[PDB]
């Protein structure tokens, strides 16, 4: 199906740039699941730690 | 708040509580002053924890 000599690559490029910007917010989700992490350590860390000043 | 509205045992009252007071009667009352404070730090440390939810 002829086409003109330049609209293949504008087509091709359309869908470089959404890879790559689809692949920045993966990179950003499982940031954000490591303060879920972070932060459940945290809270049973001082539980933990009172537990053995009251039983001392 | 606590200066001036200051007092202290007559002398005449000690004769007494010094004849009834175990050994471990002091010692207990500090305990008591002592889980206070540590609930305390527990409750703050507690509230910086729960702003890691505030970046979402």
């Avoid at chain 1, 609209?7 to 499982?30: E, Q, S």
């Avoid at chain 2, 010094?18 to 527990?42: D, E, R, T």
Wanted: net charge positive; glycine share 8%; with cysteine.
């Amino acid at each position: 199906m002829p086409v003109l000599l330049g609209i293949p690559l504008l087509l091709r490029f359309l869908g470089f740039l959404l890879v790559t910007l689809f692949g920045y917010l993966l990179t950003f989700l499982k940031k954000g699941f490591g303060k879920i992490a972070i932060a459940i350590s945290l809270f049973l860390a001082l539980i933990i730690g009172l537990n053995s000043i009251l039983v001392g | 708040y606590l200066s001036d509205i200051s007092a202290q045992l007559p002398s005449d009252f000690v004769q007494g509580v010094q004849l009834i007071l175990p050994s471990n009667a002091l010692p207990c009352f500090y305990v008591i002053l002592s889980v206070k404070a540590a609930i305390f730090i527990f409750d703050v440390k507690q509230k910086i924890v729960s702003y890691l939810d505030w970046d979402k």
